[PDB]
Structures are given as C-alpha cells and as structure tokens.
Amino acid sequence: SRRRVVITGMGMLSPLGLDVPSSWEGILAGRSGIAPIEHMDLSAYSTRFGGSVKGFNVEEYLSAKEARKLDLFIQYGLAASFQAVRDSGLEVTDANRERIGVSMGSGIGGLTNIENNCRSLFEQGPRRISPFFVPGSIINMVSGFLSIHLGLQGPNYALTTAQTTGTHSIGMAARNIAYGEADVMVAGGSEMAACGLGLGGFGAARALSTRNDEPTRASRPWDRDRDGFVLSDGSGALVLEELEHARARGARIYAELVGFGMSGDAFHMTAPPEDGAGAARCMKNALRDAGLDPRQVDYINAHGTSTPAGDIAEIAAVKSVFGEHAHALSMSSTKSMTGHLLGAAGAVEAIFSVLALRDQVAPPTINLDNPDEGCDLDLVAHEAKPRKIDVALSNSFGFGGTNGTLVFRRFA
Amino acid sequence: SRRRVVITGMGMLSPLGLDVPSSWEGILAGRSGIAPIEHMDLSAYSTRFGGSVKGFNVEEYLSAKEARKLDLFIQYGLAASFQAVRDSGLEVTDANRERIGVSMGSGIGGLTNIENNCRSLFEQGPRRISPFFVPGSIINMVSGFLSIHLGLQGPNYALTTAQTTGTHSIGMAARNIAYGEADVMVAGGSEMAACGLGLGGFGAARALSTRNDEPTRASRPWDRDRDGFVLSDGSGALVLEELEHARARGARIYAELVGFGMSGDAFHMTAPPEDGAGAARCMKNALRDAGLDPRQVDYINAHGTSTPAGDIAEIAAVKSVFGEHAHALSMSSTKSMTGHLLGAAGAVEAIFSVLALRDQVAPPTINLDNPDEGCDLDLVAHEAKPRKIDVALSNSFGFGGTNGTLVFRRFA
Ligand SMILES: NC(=O)c1ccc(NC(=O)[C@@H]2CCCO2)cc1
Ligand SMILES: NC(=O)c1ccc(NC(=O)[C@@H]2CCCO2)cc1
Numbered sequence: 001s002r003r004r005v006v007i008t009g010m011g012m013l014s015p016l017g018l019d020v021p022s023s024w025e026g027i028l029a030g031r032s033g034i035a036p037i038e039h040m041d042l043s044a045y046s047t048r049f050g051g052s053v054k055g056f057n058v059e060e061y062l063s064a065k066e067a068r069k070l071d072l073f074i075q076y077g078l079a080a081s082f083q084a085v086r087d088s089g090l091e092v093t094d095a096n097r098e099r100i101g102v103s104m105g106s107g108i109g110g111l112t113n114i115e116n117n118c119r120s121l122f123e124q125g126p127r128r129i130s131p132f133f134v135p136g137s138i139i140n141m142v143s144g145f146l147s148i149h150l151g152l153q154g155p156n157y158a159l160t161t162a163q164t165t166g167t168h169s170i171g172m173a174a175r176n177i178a179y180g181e182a183d184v185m186v187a188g189g190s191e192m193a194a195c196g197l198g199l200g201g202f203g204a205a206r207a208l209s210t211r212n213d214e215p216t217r218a219s220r221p222w223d224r225d226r227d228g229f230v231l232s233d234g235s236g237a238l239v240l241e242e243l244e245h246a247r248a249r250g251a252r253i254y255a256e257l258v259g260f261g262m263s264g265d266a267f268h269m270t271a272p273p274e275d276g277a278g279a280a281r282c283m284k285n286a287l288r289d290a291g292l293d294p295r296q297v298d299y300i301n302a303h304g305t306s307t308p309a310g311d312i313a314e315i316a317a318v319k320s321v322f323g324e325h326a327h328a329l330s331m332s333s334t335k336s337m338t339g340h341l342l343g344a345a346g347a348v349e350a351i352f353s354v355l356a357l358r359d360q361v362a363p364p365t366i367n368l369d370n371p372d373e374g375c376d377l378d379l380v381a382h383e384a385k386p387r388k389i390d391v392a393l394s395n396s397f398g399f400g401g402t403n404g405t406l407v408f409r410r411f412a
Numbered sequence: 413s414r415r416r417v418v419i420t421g422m423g424m425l426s427p428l429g430l431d432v433p434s435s436w437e438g439i440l441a442g443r444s445g446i447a448p449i450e451h452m453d454l455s456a457y458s459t460r461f462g463g464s465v466k467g468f469n470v471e472e473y474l475s476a477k478e479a480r481k482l483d484l485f486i487q488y489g490l491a492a493s494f495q496a497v498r499d500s501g502l503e504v505t506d507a508n509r510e511r512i513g514v515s516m517g518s519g520i521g522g523l524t525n526i527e528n529n530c531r532s533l534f535e536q537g538p539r540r541i542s543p544f545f546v547p548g549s550i551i552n553m554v555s556g557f558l559s560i561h562l563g564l565q566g567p568n569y570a571l572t573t574a575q576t577t578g579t580h581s582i583g584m585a586a587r588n589i590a591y592g593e594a595d596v597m598v599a600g601g602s603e604m605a606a607c608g609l610g611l612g613g614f615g616a617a618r619a620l621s622t623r624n625d626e627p628t629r630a631s632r633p634w635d636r637d638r639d640g641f642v643l644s645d646g647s648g649a650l651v652l653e654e655l656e657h658a659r660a661r662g663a664r665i666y667a668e669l670v671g672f673g674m675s676g677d678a679f680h681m682t683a684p685p686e687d688g689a690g691a692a693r694c695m696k697n698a699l700r701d702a703g704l705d706p707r708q709v710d711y712i713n714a715h716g717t718s719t720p721a722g723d724i725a726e727i728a729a730v731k732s733v734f735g736e737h738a739h740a741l742s743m744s745s746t747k748s749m750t751g752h753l754l755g756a757a758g759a760v761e762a763i764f765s766v767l768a769l770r771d772q773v774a775p776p777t778i779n780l781d782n783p784d785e786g787c788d789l790d791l792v793a794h795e796a797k798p799r800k801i802d803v804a805l806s807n808s809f810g811f812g813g814t815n816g817t818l819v820f821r822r823f824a
Binding site for chain 1 (some may be wrong): 456457481509510513514517519520521523526527529530531533534537538539541542543544545546547549550551552553555556557559560562563564565566567568569570571572573574576580584587591593608609611612613614615616617618619674675676677678679680681682690693810811812813814815
C-alpha cells in the first residue's frame, strides 16, 4: 500500500552556480546566469547567448580518464547526482543496494558529442568515430554510470519527455518508492544542448529570444516584450526516500513529495493550447493525488519559459484550477534568471520549490517590467517575497503536449 | 491491491515484415531479415549489413507533409502504435480519453535526422536547419504525435534505456494501469540507427558482427563462432488494458501481463557480468511480481544478442534462477532472425512472447550450429518447437547494466 516519499538530498549545476546553495543565493538575489556563449563561434546564429555552467570542474567528481568518454550532459548529471547522494548522508551497503535506484533523464542528450562525431564521420570517415560514441552519448548513461560507481542495483532507467523530463523523472521515481519497488531513488535531469545543432535547431523554429545586445534581460516571463526562451545548461538531482526509511536512519528531511500529476494536451507538436486546458488537467490530477484543497497552494514555480503563448497558457491554467485563490498564491518563473534548462528545468525547479518551503520565500520573476494582458496574478516581480509557504507546486510542459506537476509540502 | 493488465492490440515493423502477422510468419519459418544495407555507401565501414524495414509506406499512416517533419524512428513508432490501436478495436471518446496514455521509447532516437542536419550545418551554416529539426528528432514525439493524432490525454511519456527501452516501456505502462493512473496504455519502442553514426559508432566499439560475406549467418546467439550483434530497425507497440475495461467492451485478449522486473547490474557501461547476476535478480523480481514459482515458466524470449559475453551471461542467469527446471523450459533468441532492434528489441520480442502463448510454439534460434561451452539448454536450435506454453518471459539487458523482464501468461 502507498508509502510516503521525502527529499533527503539535492544536487545542482546551473547558470547561477556549481551547487545548490550558490545557485539558490543567486535565485534569491535576482541574479541572471545568462551571458554571450564563449565555447563556440555563434556569429552566423540569430541567438548568441544562453545560460552556461561557468567553471565546471569535472575532476571534482571523475577521473579525466572516465570524463573524456562522456558528453557534458552526462558529466553534469553525475555531478548533480554525486552532490545529492553526499547531501543525503545515505550509506550504500550490500543490505540496501538492491533497494536504491536511479532515474536521471535528458530532453535531447548528447547533442555536442553527436555533432563532434558527425564532424569526424564527414571530414575523416567512420574509423575516426570514438569507440565511446554510443555509451558516451545516450540518455540512460547518467543512470548507468551512477549505478556502476555507487553500486546501485535498484530500478535503473531514464525518461526523455523534452522540457518535462526533470518533473516526470522525479514524479515516477516517487511512484517507484510509493509502491514498494525501491526505498531510495536518485532522480532528476541534465541537459547541455548549447551546440550548433541546439542553438541552430531552436533558432530555425524561431523559439529563442534574439535579445543578443542585452542577454540578462532576454528571459522575461509574462512581460509584454518577451520574444522566446533562453537556452540553458545544467542538472538537478534529488534523493527521494521512503519516509520510515529516512526516519529509521535519522535523515535530514527537506520536504515531503505529496503529489504528482501528468496529462497530455493532445493539441500540437510544439504549441501549448491558449486556454492551458492540459496544464489545468495536470495540476488538478496532482492536487487530488496530494489530497489537497487547491486553496492550500501557497507557491507555484511556473514553467514560465518567456514564450508569448506558453506564459499566457499558464496564467489561464492557474486561474482555471485555483479560481479566486489564484490571486492569493505567489507564482514565479526562476527561468527569468536561469533560462530554460529543458530536460533539467523540472529538476532544478523542484529543488527551488523545496528551498522555497525551507526558507519561506518566493523567488522573483526578474525582468517583469510590464506584465502582459491578463498576467495580473502575484508573479513576484523583480524581488524575492518572504511569505508563508506550506505547499509548493512545480509545473513543466513540453513538446508533444506532455505536462507534469509536482506537489511538495513542509515536513514536521 | 492491484488491477490486472491484458494485451488487446499489437503492431510492428520489423526486418521480417510490415505488420505482426507477416513478421510472425517469418519467425516461425526461421527466415532471416538481415541483408547488406542499400542506398548508403558502406565501403569504409567494417559492417555493411543489418535488418532494414523493407517497403515501409508512411503515407498509409500520415500525409507526406506531416511525415517530412519526423525522423524515421518516429514514423516507425507511429506505424506500430496506429496498428496496435486499430488491432485493439478501442473507441476513444470524451468519456475515456483522459484514461488512455502512451509510452513509446527509443534507445538512440533521431540519429538519421541529426546526421542529415550536420551536413547542412557544416556546409551551409545554421540557416538551412529545418524548423522541425528538434520536435521531429526528440524521442518523446512518438508519444506526442500519437496523443495529438488520436486525442489521447492520459499519461504521456517516453523511456530511453538503450537496448532495454521496449521492455521498460511496456512494464512501466502496465504499472500505470495496475495502480489506476490509466485504463489503457500504448507502449513499446522504435529505432532506426542504420546511419554512419550508428553503424560507425557500434563499429568503433567492435560490438557488431563483421560477417559481411554471409549476413544471414551473422546473428548466431550461443553459437561458438558468433562475433557480435546485428544492427536492426523497426518498432513494436502493444495496447495494454485493465482487465474489466477489456471484458466490458468485448475486447479480444491475447494474453495477460502478470509480472515486470527491473534491476541494475551496477557492473560495466557496456558488458554484463559473466555470471549474469543482474539478469538473475531481474527475472526473480519479475516472477515475485507475478506471484509465480520459477518452475511455472515454459518459454523465455532471451535477449540473446550474439555477443560473446551477453549470450553466456543469460545461460548462467537462467540456470541460477531455474535450477532443475532450466532444461524443461525452452529459451530462444528471435534476434537470430530479426537482429538487434535496440530500444525496439523489447517491444517486438514482447509481441513474439505473446504470439508464442497464442500459438503454443517456441520460435527457433536459427544459426545455432555449434552451441558454445555450457550452452546446453533447450535453445530451440534451427526450427520452431510446438510445445505447451502457459507462462512466457521476455528479457532485455542494455548499456548501463539496465535489465528488464516481462512475464506473460495465457488468459482464459
Ligand atoms: N565521491 C563522491 O561521491 C562525490 C560527492 C560529492 C562531490 N562534490 C560535491 O558535493 C560538491 C563539490 C563542491 C560543493 O559540493 C564530489 C564527489
Ligand atoms: N479536496 C480534498 O480535500 C481531497 C482530499 C482527499 C483526496 N484524495 C486522497 O487523499 C486520495 C489520495 C489519492 C486519491 O485519493 C482528494 C481531495
């Protein structure tokens, strides 16, 4: 019968820092992680900036021998996983290793490695493709490499649901624990799509902000002058643990994961419906799953991508789900500061939602200078808002009309 | 407690045929779908053959214009899914559409599309990249496009667990239904990795058979002269349905899905442990999940990739799990005929396991001319074996040491 699930460890790489506490201090100070991209020549691209991870040292985590074989998205997922496991204080043993699994996902996976090997294939031929090309590029290898290095023999898998990946990964990992398939899961996501194909591909769809001359102002969710999402890199991982397992070992518990929802829009490959009907179905599934009155929701970490249609669909969904309470809760997009970490978005945003509970503060939506038509909720414009938060909701919506919602609450 | 899950529809593209019945006729006849790859200069490659889908007409399913937006692996997953839904006779309505979801995965996803866009990017720069490059290439678009086409509003996600994808997709969809999150799921996998990067990538790892002179003899699971796996394309989809939901509408039920196991080896990035400890744990987990004794298993659809280490690991795992029953069950690798469909392997092999139950016949392991040291089980060498089959297992073992087992039983 269904067990309770708590958060005992968290780990992160983001455009604002190389761990959770540095990232969160940036979030609460309203600091932007967005800057011109330095790692390649973007002069022929319509977008030349994004949220890069700055000064990542893989030799904090892995031998340069192992690290050379792995795409950056895998390096980033392993860094966040290692941080989360250490933060949890969990000791892996012969007695518990079969009950500890991993579900670390990615939206796009090893696009840089595939680009570089494509360059070798076309310029020099197939014999120059890396022997490590496949295991170094495919999305399940965060889960694989983490399991090999820590000795995790529990459920081992990976989700890929585009921009919903991190939220779905955490939710489904919680279901694993809830239903008795594992006692512990490391779950979240990682992304590093800042290569020619990534910036070029999103560029070809005209989905990216082209505010090259003021990158820190590009990501402006619900602002009338928004002109698309900002592409960002990084990773979030959480250690999810059955409640009595966490209590038995004296774990520090950050918060409880009480609700998880999923829905499909069944509308369009890339565009969200204007009314947010799919997002609303998803949130309602999540709140019913958590046994909550919608009026209990104090904080929403929005998907809030800074796209014309996505930002307004989310207002419509929140008004539909919460009615008059939509005017009492606080809703913010941390993507205003971090940009859009795609498959990692839901994982870092789940961590920001847990810290909003820990610290009783709503992170700001920076750059919200002129809220658009109908964007009249408390969107925590400009500056962090200390307030009561018992229940926090984290939303993600992706290509293919795939929606996820996570519901967290304080644990006492 | 938990709801029962039955299979009411199946769909497939394979190297043996463009649907399930034609594929299955090939399987029972011991026919190979392996041939030198056409319309692609493979002179510089150490492997020049594979399992191609022959004569696929996407316009049976999509307009030319919508098909042009989608990588071949998505077209193949949509064909299998459309076939499965049609095979099920399910009528989607406003009363049930929220209860019908999709979990179609891929191991490698849109390599062909990525490859063809690298050409544009390197030669002509980013402005030639297709606007549909991202949504047309990402693994969750089979689930996405199927939900949009059929109006499915249930759980919408995609697994990517390398060669375990199709098995995990079906098992995790079955759980969704068992635990009441959906009444119907369309689940399985698709793969089209026969590009330079696929053939070159596996080739650079020396993972592939190089038996260019006799492609139909290359895939020879447990044969002493095997020299690695054969790369194959295609897709499988199953309609999973809650038992009372299937009975109420008068559905034709192929078989019941009674068990699902997962385990991580935590051993090596690409090689299974010699003793198959991980595959043994996973099968034991699946039998416990089904409430069945090892002695009740009659037929195993092996992973049986024709790699030296993989094939022997599976014999060790089966002897360990099944003890004095190991010789009474029949175990075969249909990869002897189909080659290795990677993330689709588990999907098409779940279909073969279901049809083994329907037709009371163990498919052959073709090319098993000289069983290797210790390969003394009933591996159904050369020809199909009619026999009693009440319980059938389908095993998948993939990169990252990720394992899955499905347990099917006759329904009456
Ligand atoms: N051996 C491990 O499992 C491992 C765990 C954690 C780390 N690093 C951190 O936790 C970071 C380093 C600075 C801030 O936090 C490195 C290795
Ligand atoms: N609005 C409410 O006060 C409320 C209370 C309880 C529930 N449901 C449950 O607690 C269980 C948990 C999974 C579904 O049923 C729903 C709503």
